[model samples]
Target: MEMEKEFEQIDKSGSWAAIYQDIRHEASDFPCRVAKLPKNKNRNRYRDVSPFDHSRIKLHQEDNDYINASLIKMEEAQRSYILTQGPLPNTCGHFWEMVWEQKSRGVVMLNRVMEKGSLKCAQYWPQKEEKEMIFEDTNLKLTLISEDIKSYYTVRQLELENLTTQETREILHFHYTTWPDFGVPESPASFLNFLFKVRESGSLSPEHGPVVVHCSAGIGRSGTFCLADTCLLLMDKRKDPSSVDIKKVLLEMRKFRMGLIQTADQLRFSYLAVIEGAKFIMGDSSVQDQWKELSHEDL
Candidate 1:
């Protein structure tokens, strides 16, 4: 399973998503993509191609009953120069305002270096958060690639000056998606906003978006994002991707990024979140352990 150049893949022998393993990692920054093929049975689900449009909502209709499906991709390393700096108080404005001011059209994303209350410090949102804080003061070159942004998020600079080691640690532990938590509507806009964040955070374009998702152990939030993106990518390629296969995706994620499930707490976060449900799992056991059985295929 650890073979570098070549390895054994699950005997899937199917799906347009299988085409992704052939994409070979470029010096990219994102984790997702919606490619245009030369016409085939795959084009029925291009709704994800452009995530900004809110007038029309598209949902991936197919659902995979099992969870063991996956496509293999060879890993390649890329170089990104890193710079550090102190915080500038004036530049650290609200993140939502900054993103709108920039009028960022595509996804704008980054790796989180800190955390606080379900958010990461390194994961720059609203773009302005770091631009005003990180680059202005520290002369940093952001390696995370992403698309333009929609509404919501201040996009300020990375406010590292005020943050404690704990905050910074949170950034490394959380994959913060910078988007406004809008009022729930027909489209259930949260999913689109997440996709937009992932797009900017170097997940959408796949080849040149965000390369490494790091936090404390690089597990937990990073794994959740990766699992979500994997399923979305499969749907983008017209394949049925399900939530049960989170473990399968994590097994592969450990190969490139360290600490995807580094601790027991990290591994259980998803379970607790799902069981407790509705965001912050405030202690609810309504959904028992066997809510759904994950056979070898499902898990």
Candidate 2:
């Protein structure tokens, strides 16, 4: 069978949905501590983007310790990610507040401000050349120092500082801007390149708290990115590219946050990206040529 055909069959067989449902059931068995959070005025953002209690990321040294974020750590693979939603207008201050409190070194954004004529995400990062924005409630400021724009992605260097303490930090904004509303990327090459770019920045390193990753809802695209990144890292760690089980790893990841790998198409793409990445890392010279060919199209 052709590669694409086999993937289609798997998606059609319905077992994939079964696994997804099973993961949800597993998550339901655990206690959701965040459910206990009060619906205070500060929690306006929680109604739709609330964090799963088991793995919620708590804000430290704050008047309101509420933020819609989760700490999803793949312990064995040694990858830590703060999976979250795209900032809403009202939650923009809380978003920057979490970045400051968590001491995050970077953010991986996987959505655009508008998609299909819909408001997909807020303009959380500062405008280019306009330079900065102050989150008054959080007493924080973000300044855009530089930006590298590519055909499929953009990377920005942001300066974040706490106004009261005068402590400052540099943050990387890695945004995958070309993803569609309900499908995979045109190819895995661009996606993998973006993933490696994040890896190169040392943002995903444990030395930092966690790299914040978000799409519109922080589940579908964000989950796919995390799955592929974690699998590739695990492959490197074990020195056995073919030994990693993508499905098992994904099921484990879903325990930390609900509804990861939203669609079978996303899951299928994650597997392909992992396999392509494994080929690249395992010294396949032809893989680079493949990437160039794939990424060159429609970019």
Candidate 3:
């Protein structure tokens, strides 16, 4: 009740500006020494956004063990997410390697390869024509098995092979192509639809490793998605969903990875998504029908 009440009050009163600013001011300033090292500089996509040293994923490479990826764990919500930046050309192999080493079942990508005339992310995965890509750096081969395209997102089935050991695994790549850089999606419904699809695959469950999530900088859109998802899960577990403090939840997440929910707009969108998503979790099946229609997923 408090969650919905707070959201409605903010919506009606137009006080999101103040609320978002408070959350921004409350975020932690953790040390990210590894990401600042001269050797690890190129691994980061943005100069300012870096994973906390304590939470950064350590690759098991021979001499190098750096990646712009942070392991965000919300134990209370029983959720684990690897918040990371979009892969750089040199870090592409390490990206897949992280997935392999962590035993993650799915990757939730919230950005496109290119955005607004700038290259936001490297072409890390193979296209339909290429079919497959082999990374000599990690001795890994990725073969595209199938791709399901929709208006706003694409779901691809990929076979990941360790070339040296000749072992293979299936990895689901959930790419949201329409989410603009530094902006929220067209609707919370569409974002939730995509989020639920990833959840239905059992990828985010504890049985598997953490679901790898990323956008251009990994802290903005990536942070938004994880915050919304984790908060919803916490809401579902609590007897009184209103007890969930959206700002507190975000601040907790910021401890693991800095600069989540970049702009005030992104912070506002997280509230909208969580409040709307709570309706579905509370057993309003009709809301999903509305979400599906509003999202135009079939188109």
Candidate 4:
């Protein structure tokens, strides 16, 4: 009932702006002291986007433990995500180190390395030609094993090896390339299809560590993805899907990170994706086929 009422309000002309404003007004302001330290300054992709001191992930390595990353946990949905900025050139080793230490099974990258003639994220992973990349600082090597390319996204299989111990693990890299900078996807169908693809991997399950999710800044698109996902999961578990409160769930997630769902448009898109995704979860098996057709993912 609550979600339906909220949905109706958002559907009205000019109501989304007011609702987005309220959510922003309700956002928490937690301190981030480590991110501001002079020694740690260059590690952050955007100075304004910093991980909260309380929820920030700390590296286990001696001397340096800070990375521009936060762990967001939703106990009810049994989901946990590491929301972080795209890796800085200098912070690539730290990023890989975080993945190794956290034992994450997948990396969900929501933005491109270059957007609108600007660099949004570093070329953190090895290019197809290169095949493999080594992070000397972290004593880790990442090798590109397989790639499945679609019109809007690429699913890559990577081999993560620890040079020191000679141990290796498989990692899935889901890169959504078409999402624009500071903008929502063109349609929720495509986004939902991508989300479901990642879901099919079992990387988001409680059995694995948090899946590392990032866009350019790691809050806008990253937050939007997580919000839609957790909401759908909650909807599936509850007798009444409408009982889930999208805004409240977002507020809860923001406690562990900052400035999630950056724009009013992104907030709006989250709702759209959740509503569309609910059909699939609520016994409308044909909806997934419709989403696939609507998304035109193969194109």
- The residue-by-residue lDDT of candidate 2 on 1-299, one tens digit each, is 13334456766885666655655566433455554556544543345445677788776644656667778888899878899888888778888888877878999999899998988788887876585898987788889899888888889999998998999999999988889766787478888878877988999887987899998888889999999999888888877865777778888887787778777677778878887788766667576666656666345
Per candidate, the number of residue pairs that clash is: 61, 0, 0, 0
Between prediction 2 and prediction 3, the one with superior lDDT is: 3
Instruction: Write out the backbone clash pairs for model 4.
Output: none
lDDT of model 2, residue 38: 67
Mark the 10 consecutive residues where model 3 has the least summed lDDT.
178-187
Query: What's model 2's TM-score?
Result: 0.87
Better of 1 and 2 by TM-score: 2
**Per-residue lDDT for 88-203 in model 1, tens only?**
22222222222222222222232333334443332343343334334342222232223332232223222222222222200111123332232111221333334333455432
Q: Please give the lDDT score at residue 80 for candidate 3.
A: 93
Q: In model 1, which regions exceed 4 Å deviation?
A: 1-192, 200-203, 206-212, 242-244, 262-299
For each candidate, the alpha-carbon lDDT, in order, equals 0.29, 0.79, 0.88, 0.89
* TM-score on alpha carbons, each prediction: 0.32, 0.87, 0.96, 0.96
Question: For candidate 3, lDDT tens digit of each residue in 1-299?
Answer: 68778878887999878988888788888788888999987788899888899899999988989999999989799899999999999999999999999999999998888788899899999897366898999999998999999998999999999898999999999998888654576468899888888988989888899999998889888988899999889888974577799899999999999888878788878888988898888888788778777889777
Residue clash pairs of candidate 3: none
Better of 2 and 4 by lDDT: 4
Rank the models by TM-score, top first.
4, 3, 2, 1
Off by over 4 Å in 2: 1-29, 33-49, 285-293, 297-299
Better of 3 and 4 by TM-score: 4
Per-residue lDDT of candidate 4, residues 195-214 (tens digit) = 99999998998888999999
